[PDB]
Each structure stands twice: as structure tokens, then as C-alpha cells.
Amino acid sequence: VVDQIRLWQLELDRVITYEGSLYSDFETSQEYNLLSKYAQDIGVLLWKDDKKKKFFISKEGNSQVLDFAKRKL
Amino acid sequence: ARARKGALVQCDPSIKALILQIDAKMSDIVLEELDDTHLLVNPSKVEFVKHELNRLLS
């Protein structure tokens, strides 16, 4: 019957959304790889994609990675 | 080299498809389709999307 709707609602409650910042437009693979590995290391990396040279960082990690970026590039 | 604030939405492909259809008709919701299970969404619209999704089930 339609407790198919019930399984849809359950899956709907398994959606996750985060505030933060998408980083993109990198000159070099090196720099993209440097910041995302730093973000991975301090636990604030939520998503990345090597081929697009993009990643997303949580809000609470935002200034740590900006400050790392100023210091190391 | 560039940062932009947003809301990262992580969801099953089935629900991604509903979101994109909600966006088709309301238009102002999806900034970028990131991969199979991730969307970059207008932060002000997360409420609305979560509200609208829930309603589609009724």
C-alpha cells in the first residue's frame, strides 16, 4: 500500500544541510589540494571534488582556513 | 582563489530530484548541482525547501 509515503518521509528526515562556504576557482591543483587537506585535517571539510577543484567547508571552520590561506599562499 | 557562502544539502538522489523540480517552478533555490548527493542551495531557501518537500508528502 502507500506507507511508501512513510518510507519517503523517513528518507526525507535523512537529509543533512550545513552552513559554510564553497571554495573554487583555484589556479593550481597544488593550492586546491593544500587547503582542502588542511580543512580535512582540522575536521571542517564537508565535501570536495578534485576534478572541479572545488570544496565546501563548514561555517565554523571558515576563518581557520582563510587564515591558513593568508599565511601559506 | 574564491569563496562563496551557501548551504550544502546532502541527500539521497531520490530527494535531489524533488528539490530540482521544486526549483524548476520557484526558480531561486539551487545555486549549483555539486554531485549525485549534494546541492549548493540559496541559504535563505533551506527553510522553504524543507517545508515544501514535507508538503509534497500529503
Swiss-Prot record, chain A:
Localization per Swiss-Prot or TrEMBL: Nucleus
Top-rank taxon, per record: Eukaryota
Subunit structure: Component of the 7-subunit TFIIH core complex composed of XPB/SSL2, XPD/RAD3, SSL1, TFB1, TFB2, TFB4 and TFB5, which is active in NER. The core complex associates with the 3-subunit CTD-kinase module TFIIK composed of CCL1, KIN28 and TFB3 to form the 10-subunit holoenzyme (holo-TFIIH) active in transcription. An additionnal subunit, TFB6, plays a role in the dissociation of the SSL2 helicase from TFIIH after transcription initiation. Interacts with TFB5.
Protein role: Component of the general transcription and DNA repair factor IIH (TFIIH) core complex, which is involved in general and transcription-coupled nucleotide excision repair (NER) of damaged DNA and, when complexed to TFIIK, in RNA transcription by RNA polymerase II. In NER, TFIIH acts by opening DNA around the lesion to allow the excision of the damaged oligonucleotide and its replacement by a new DNA fragment. In transcription, TFIIH has an essential role in transcription initiation.
Extra information: Present with 8900 molecules/cell in log phase SD medium.
Stated family: Belongs to the TFB2 family.
Protein name: General transcription and DNA repair factor IIH subunit TFB2
Lineage, broadest ranks: Eukaryota, Fungi, Dikarya, Ascomycota, Saccharomycotina
Gene: TFB2
Parent-protein residues present: 437 to 509 of 513
Swiss-Prot record, chain B:
GO BP: nucleotide-excision repair; nucleotide-excision repair, preincision complex assembly; transcription by RNA polymerase II; transcription initiation at RNA polymerase II promoter
UniProt keyword Ion transport, yes or no: no
Main location as per UniProt: nucleus
Any one GO cellular component localisation term in the record: cytosol
Acetylation in keyword set: no
Subcellular location(s) of the protein: Nucleus
Complexes and interactors: Component of the 7-subunit TFIIH core complex composed of XPB/SSL2, XPD/RAD3, SSL1, TFB1, TFB2, TFB4 and TFB5, which is active in NER. The core complex associates with the 3-subunit CTD-kinase module TFIIK composed of CCL1, KIN28 and TFB3 to form the 10-subunit holoenzyme (holo-TFIIH) active in transcription. An additionnal subunit, TFB6, plays a role in the dissociation of the SSL2 helicase from TFIIH after transcription initiation. Interacts with TFB2.
Protein name (record): General transcription and DNA repair factor IIH subunit TFB5
High-level lineage: Eukaryota, Fungi, Dikarya, Ascomycota, Saccharomycotina
Gene that this sequence comes from: TFB5
Residues of the full protein shown: 2 to 59 of 72
